Write an enzyme that holds these catalytic residues in place. Structure first.
Site, mmCIF file in Angstrom:
data_model
loop_
_atom_site.group_PDB
_atom_site.id
_atom_site.type_symbol
_atom_site.label_atom_id
_atom_site.label_comp_id
_atom_site.label_asym_id
_atom_site.label_seq_id
_atom_site.Cartn_x
_atom_site.Cartn_y
_atom_site.Cartn_z
ATOM 1 N N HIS A 88 -21.388 0.022 -27.696
ATOM 2 C CA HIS A 88 -21.584 0.575 -29.133
ATOM 3 C C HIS A 88 -21.711 1.875 -29.193
ATOM 4 O O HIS A 88 -21.907 2.490 -28.465
ATOM 5 C CB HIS A 88 -22.456 -0.307 -30.597
ATOM 6 N N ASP A 91 -21.127 7.425 -35.518
ATOM 7 C CA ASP A 91 -20.312 7.996 -36.088
ATOM 8 C C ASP A 91 -20.832 8.352 -37.312
ATOM 9 O O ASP A 91 -20.305 7.378 -38.531
ATOM 10 C CB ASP A 91 -18.695 8.236 -36.149
ATOM 11 N N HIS A 93 -20.284 10.337 -40.950
ATOM 12 C CA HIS A 93 -18.924 11.330 -42.089
ATOM 13 C C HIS A 93 -19.864 11.995 -42.297
ATOM 14 O O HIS A 93 -19.905 13.968 -42.694
ATOM 15 C CB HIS A 93 -17.909 10.849 -42.094
ATOM 16 N N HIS A 128 -20.220 4.804 -39.262
ATOM 17 C CA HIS A 128 -19.445 3.354 -38.980
ATOM 18 C C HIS A 128 -19.587 3.411 -37.638
ATOM 19 O O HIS A 128 -19.701 5.186 -36.721
ATOM 20 C CB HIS A 128 -18.518 3.143 -39.568
ATOM 21 N N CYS A 129 -19.320 2.455 -36.279
ATOM 22 C CA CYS A 129 -19.582 2.611 -34.999
ATOM 23 C C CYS A 129 -17.708 2.829 -35.091
ATOM 24 O O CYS A 129 -17.343 2.251 -35.445
ATOM 25 C CB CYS A 129 -19.832 0.948 -35.050
ATOM 26 N N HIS A 138 -14.505 -3.232 -34.214
ATOM 27 C CA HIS A 138 -15.975 -2.979 -34.804
ATOM 28 C C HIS A 138 -16.422 -2.927 -36.213
ATOM 29 O O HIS A 138 -17.350 -3.253 -36.920
ATOM 30 C CB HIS A 138 -16.269 -2.196 -33.665
ATOM 31 N N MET A 143 -19.544 -3.557 -38.610
ATOM 32 C CA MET A 143 -20.344 -1.963 -38.531
ATOM 33 C C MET A 143 -20.051 -1.208 -38.957
ATOM 34 O O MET A 143 -19.653 0.230 -38.716
ATOM 35 C CB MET A 143 -19.773 -1.876 -36.977
ATOM 36 N N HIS A 248 -15.546 -1.820 -61.202
ATOM 37 C CA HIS A 248 -15.489 -1.679 -62.279
ATOM 38 C C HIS A 248 -16.956 -2.299 -62.431
ATOM 39 O O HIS A 248 -16.763 -3.451 -61.871
ATOM 40 C CB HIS A 248 -14.001 -2.120 -62.694
ATOM 41 N N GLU A 272 -13.766 4.808 -66.794
ATOM 42 C CA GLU A 272 -13.514 2.859 -66.630
ATOM 43 C C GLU A 272 -13.304 1.999 -65.461
ATOM 44 O O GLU A 272 -14.125 0.969 -65.312
ATOM 45 C CB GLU A 272 -12.258 2.036 -67.740
ATOM 46 N N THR A 273 -12.558 2.566 -64.602
ATOM 47 C CA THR A 273 -12.266 1.942 -63.761
ATOM 48 C C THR A 273 -12.624 3.715 -62.521
ATOM 49 O O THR A 273 -11.447 4.549 -63.288
ATOM 50 C CB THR A 273 -10.628 1.358 -62.443
ATOM 51 N N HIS A 299 -11.340 -3.664 -59.311
ATOM 52 C CA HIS A 299 -10.663 -4.144 -60.135
ATOM 53 C C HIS A 299 -8.776 -4.748 -59.735
ATOM 54 O O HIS A 299 -7.770 -4.475 -60.502
ATOM 55 C CB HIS A 299 -10.383 -3.538 -61.410
HETATM 56 CU CU LIG Z 1 -19.668 -1.435 -32.536
HETATM 57 CU CU LIG Z 2 -15.031 7.790 -39.839
HETATM 58 CU CU LIG Z 3 -10.933 -5.928 -66.390
#
Ligand SMILES: [Cu+2]
Ligand SMILES: [Cu+2]
Ligand SMILES: [Cu+2]
Ligand SMILES: [Cu+2]
Ligand SMILES: [Cu+2]
Ligand SMILES: [Cu+2]
Lengths: 333, 333, 333
Positions: A88, A91, A93, A128-129, A138, A143, A248, A272-273, A299
């Site tokens: 494993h 990473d 961001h 994330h892995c 993964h 993960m 939402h 709203e969303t 939603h």
């Molecule tokens: Cu992993």
């Molecule tokens: Cu990424």
């Molecule tokens: Cu709705």
């Protein structure tokens, strides 16, 4: 330089809860130290007992939310115990260089490593892995998690005025692709490796079998609903490491929303969303004005009510009839 | 207080048309009263005669567009006649509390109810049926529409200057999931309940069989195309209650677009295509500069041209050669 | 008027490269002339030798990037040689009227035509083939590209300060739907017409079999990776004519991003991932700060790593330990 900076160790907590932190920074830049242990484990994800071999950061899906301030240094100790079966890595961001740290953090079972990176940009980011050749496997096995890099002076609205939350919750949304037999029944495996070949064929269909919040259908319902009171300002961080989602709050709104989660941009108002692209973390701020149960959902209602992407908020307080009222209760015409 | 406010009753019109209203409010806050009757009915949605059991607000898919101003009170009388077979309710994304009103509006056939709510946020919002346990089934059966809450001083551009439309149209986009037999032919049912079990299996595939504007393939074409003239400013409100869409005017643009439809945010300029997340209503403003036929489409072209998400605009006026001209007409090399 | 304007002929280059141009306009408005030849051809899109009948503008997938300035006139000579078998045309999202030019540019094999249009709006736009009745088939067969209309004074940040790029690359993302037999093996055809009937059934599934950058799995990898150096400012234009995508630079960010690609709007800052709606072109600006390999991907990781939507950037320069450093290299606990 770094040698001379103060250091603080922080113990993480299980999602949807978040570790203690200060919104507005009280000290100058520091080296913030975290420790995460990788845990491969079986997890039943639905009511019928469907079981999968989850790959987790600290034993949870999603992994825990890390909170630091702009320009602090994040120092992470990553441990892959000998009880695990796979290689494993991680990473971020939020980081710059070496594939977000992925190329510097490859650990086989029985190994550990320590990575440090400067948090140069404020916002919520996904981590994330990502092992070469089995990245999607993964990630879609749970993960992934998120890290929040708060501006040193806290959050602000579109006019540059302060926004202070009383409560913060972290909702990690996960798309799962459980292999099925000819009739449509989900398969079961002894170890992660036994599942591999079938997992790849299941992912290629691009159709998740389950989409859940906090690792399981109904994880944030019943006794596990999120809580708040009328008048409280709540910040909800939401992440999706592989697939788009559209959060939402049923019965409410997103008063201030950073859909792509980067704080140097002004927030969107009265949503709203909102759309959070796969591979992104976003944040929505709302002040509760009515008591009762609220459903927090993706939603696309099929994904929410048929597939598992639904949670609850139970809010206490007095009902406001000016905002809403039943003039004539349901009755025979 | 409310007792003392003036009240006006408004009669709704069938989509794509919109009931008469004022852009800039001429009076102070009022109680605006509407009445909607639920109608369960068979609807043929395509050329081959495919028929479904639609669940509608006022007999149309989408339900009618309601137009009020910020801080008015919306008072809705909802009637579910004894000729219907199912329990229905209504959730307004524009409202605050009780699941958007869903928890206060449950009516069985033969019942009616009256809900009132304060329109505190300006923008276009989705409203839809949401009965506990069968939410996606009612929504994807066409039971959704939209409400527009205009700022009391009308629409404005990014610089705060007034935007006045001459025409307004409401386009409701609907994703349908018609059950199929082994060979791929669509099934037919006697009543809504007979369809239930199969409907759920069809929805879980996450792949619509039809995606249409105004309830049917080709509904806004031929003699039903939307009309305008060169020089007219047109506002197009578009809603999608369950699935993402990406509207586009072929041969034109969205001069001012509120993709997530909330008016307190400045609009985006010069859009070629914009994303409206499932569970949201958006609005685009454009001034016609060339005459002719324009195709208004969901820009996933398979969804537009194969599945049904395409409509037309026929515009009258003089052609402008400065904007566009055929220098050499198609001819043999 | 146009008669009196200066004219310059420009020769296009193959993607990911872009033809020479000036960011800030040095002259006044001009008539910019381009020539494109349609080429129907077989293309193998993956490692296993899967072959398709691609429909291209100038022999490439995507077609070449055209670069002009706001208010210049674009004059395009479009040639469909007699060696082709199908009718084609062109629709510019940058243009106003006649379906983006589609209704004025229908050419059968052996014909040519010349269209002129005024570039009134600045931004990156998609252009694509759109023949009545077979629009999705031509688009998903690779017949699309993009055009960039730069403001006459170049690019600017949110505060109106100049943004100057040292390098620019064009990444065209393509979703393919290759017909399959019962066992899942891809079919092969002699001519485009032989593929037609099967192509339509494949598209209706809404599930691409391949999603690639620059026409093939691995097209922008190995010896074809994009290059840059630490300190260089790079503009990456990305287009998707039919389907949504969510670009992400692994190990980096989008310092300034116009996700919907229209330059009169301020860019979004510090994006980790951004959503480009199907039928749209977007642009991201980034300054490299670390050397090494970066993976540029569509962040639905299944689409990136299983389906083909992944490319590389190899950057030269000195490593910055302040930004990132391995404190303890992977080792046994
Ligand atoms: Cu992993
Ligand atoms: Cu990424
Ligand atoms: Cu709705
Ligand atoms: Cu209903
Ligand atoms: Cu063509
Ligand atoms: Cu188009």
């Amino acid at each position: 330089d770094i040698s001379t900076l103060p250091r603080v160790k922080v113990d993480l907590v299980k999602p949807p809860f978040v570790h203690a932190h200060d919104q507005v920074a009280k000290t100058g830049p520091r080296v913030v130290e975290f420790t995460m242990t990788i845990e491969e484990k079986k997890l039943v994800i639905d009511r019928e007992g469907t079981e999968i071999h989850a790959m987790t950061f600290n034993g949870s899906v999603p992994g825990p939310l890390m909170v630091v301030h702009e320009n602090d240094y994040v120092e992470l100790r990553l441990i892959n115990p000998d009880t695990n079966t796979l290689l494993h890595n991680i990473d971020f961001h939020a980081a710059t260089g070496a594939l977000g740290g992925g190329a510097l953090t490859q650990v086989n079972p029985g190994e550990e490593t320590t990575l440090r990176f400067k948090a140069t940009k404020p916002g919520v980011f996904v981590y994330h892995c990502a092992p070469e050749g089995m990245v999607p496997w993964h990630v879609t096995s749970g993960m992934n998690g998120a890290i929040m890099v708060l501006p040193r002076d806290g959050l602000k609205d579109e006019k540059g005025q302060p926004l202070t939350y009383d409560k913060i919750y972290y909702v990690g949304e996960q798309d799962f692709y459980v292999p099925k037999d000819e009739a449509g029944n989900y398969k079961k495996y002894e170890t992660p490796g036994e599942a591999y070949e079938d997992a790849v064929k299941a992912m290629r269909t691009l159709t998740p079998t389950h989409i859940v919040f906090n690792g399981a259908v109904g994880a944030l319902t019943g006794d596990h609903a999120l809580t708040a009171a009328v008048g409280e300002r709540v910040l909800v961080v939401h992440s999706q490491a592989n697939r788009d989602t559209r959060p939402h709050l049923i019965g409410g709104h997103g008063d201030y929303v950073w859909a792509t989660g980067k704080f140097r941009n002004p927030p969107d108002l009265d949503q709203e969303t909102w759309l959070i692209p796969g591979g992104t973390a976003g944040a929505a701020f709302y002040t509760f004005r009515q008591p009762g149960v609220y459903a927090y959902v993706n939603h696309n209602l099929i994904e929410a009510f048929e597939l598992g992407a639904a949670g609850h908020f139970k809010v206490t307080g007095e009902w406001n009839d000016d905002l809403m009222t039943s003039v004539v209760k349901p009755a025979s015409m």
